[PDB]
């Protein structure tokens, strides 16, 4: 089956460039496009690249800073880039009887510097009992965190991260039986890959 | 340039209904339409192109119409990975521009939040920080309020908020409310209250403690 597949993560500073590649198992056979979809954000056309004629057309917003390339491998070069770029990127063509999305490749252009997360435990001041994890001051995104090293998956989310001042903050919420809690042990794990840390933090009752 | 205006931006329904979504456009098209669905953050995926054909292992309780600069999605009898939101995409001529998008999510009985508020760990106080935390858990509706008090007095210069997506497994919300302040300024006061406004009730949900206790 076609699938394209994009290159991983970017983080930029206002005014570099980057370049995303996007590579199909099969292939010029039928044209593609660029998508972009901002953080919370719907879907906007970016242009089309006619492969046949290598003619590109952009959408208005684009022209300038955004280019298309293709050597297969297809490329989306951004220069002068700004904190609006900051945003998810989709190629996609389209062949038979449907179209076919890579998996994205998200941006992140800021001057903040990578910083890892500070993580405390929440716990409280019944039969079920919720815990929590703050992450809070890291970047850039995203963190993923875990209860028990995933043994602990059911009564869990994670809420969205926002950001204070180039800094992005998290909480994640577990709920166990008080029958399991402090008896055994509840740790949350947190991964800030870009900053490669990792940090266990046990919930220890007041 | 051709825009396209996409309704209702937000639906609510479950499992065995049909809605509609319908796009249309400043300017004829001429069938030059594809439907999208996107789950979670995800890629999105082909339902329907050139206004009414079905992409391959689309389920056939999808189906698209219209002509002109008038065209509709509808999907009938509802299944649970049919939630999430759809987008609508012309390709008459550049730029081929994109519906704003409709979010279809879960109609379920109405739910309070349940309320959990932390003080400060001993950590983050030892090194001069202060946030308090206050979860407001698997409730129904989205709509909700969060309100802080400290000493019987409303707080809301340092509160940030966030919301969770609709829960895929019991299609409730969640919302998380950070008060922070510093050392100093969360000593100087006793009691800290998180109070929610949500419509399973007409009084406060609250939930608080005493920095002394
Ligand atoms: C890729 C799109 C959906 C799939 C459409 C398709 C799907 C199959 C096919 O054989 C040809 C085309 C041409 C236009 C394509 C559309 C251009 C805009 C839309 O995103």
């Known amino acids: 089956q076609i699938q394209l597949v994009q290159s991983g993560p970017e983080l930029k500073k206002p005014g570099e460039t980057v370049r995303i590649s996007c590579k199909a198992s099969?292939?010029?056979?039928?044209?593609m496009q660029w998508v972009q979809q901002m953080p919370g954000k719907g879907l906007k056309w970016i242009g089309w690249?006619?492969?046949?004629?290598?003619?590109?057309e952009y959408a208005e917003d684009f022209k300038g800073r955004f280019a298309f390339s293709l050597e297969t491998t297809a490329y989306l070069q951004i220069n002068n880039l700004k904190n609006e770029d900051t945003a998810t990127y989709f190629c996609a063509t389209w062949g038979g009887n449907s179209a076919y999305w890579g998996q994205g490749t998200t941006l992140t252009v800021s001057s903040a510097k990578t910083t890892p997360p500070s993580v405390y435990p929440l716990a409280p001041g019944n039969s079920m009992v919720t815990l929590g994890c703050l992450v809070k001051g890291y970047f850039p995104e995203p963190v993923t965190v875990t209860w028990n090293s995933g043994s602990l998956s059911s009564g869990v989310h994670t809420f969205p991260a926002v950001l204070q001042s180039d800094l992005y903050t998290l909480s994640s919420s577990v709920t166990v039986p008080s029958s399991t809690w402090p008896s055994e042990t509840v740790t949350c794990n947190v991964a800030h890959p870009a900053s490669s840390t990792k940090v266990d933090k046990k919930i220890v009752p007041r | 340039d051709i825009q396209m205006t996409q309704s209702p931006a937000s639906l609510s329904a479950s499992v065995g209904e049909t809605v509609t979504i319908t796009c249309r456009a400043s300017?004829?098209?001429?069938?030059?339409l594809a439907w999208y669905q996107q789950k979670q953050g995800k890629s999105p995926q082909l339902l329907v192109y050139?206004?009414?054909t079905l992409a391959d292992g689309v389920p056939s309780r999808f189906s698209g119409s219209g002509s002109g600069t008038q065209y509709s999605l509808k999907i009938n009898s509802l299944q649970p990975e049919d939630f999430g939101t759809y987008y609508c995409?012309?390709?008459?001529?550049?730029?081929?521009?994109f519906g704003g998008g409709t979010k279809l999510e879960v109609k379920r009985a109405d739910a309070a939040p349940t309320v959990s508020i932390f003080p400060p760990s001993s950590e983050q106080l030892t090194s001069g920080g202060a946030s308090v935390v206050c979860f407001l858990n698997n409730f129904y509706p989205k709509d909700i309020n969060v309100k802080w008090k400290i000493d019987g007095s409303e707080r809301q210069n340092g509160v940030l908020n966030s919301w969770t997506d609709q829960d895929s497994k019991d299609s409730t919300y969640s919302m998380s409310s950070t008060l922070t302040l510093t050392k100093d300024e969360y000593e100087r006061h006793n009691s800290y209250t998180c109070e929610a406004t949500h419509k399973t009730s007409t009084s406060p949900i609250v939930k608080s403690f005493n920095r002394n206790e």
């Open positions: 995409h012309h390709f008459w001529s550049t730029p081929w521009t």
């Open positions: 050139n206004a009414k």
């Open positions: 099969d292939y010029m056979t039928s044209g």
């Open positions: 300017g004829n098209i001429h069938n030059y």
């Open positions: 690249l006619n492969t046949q004629s290598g003619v590109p």
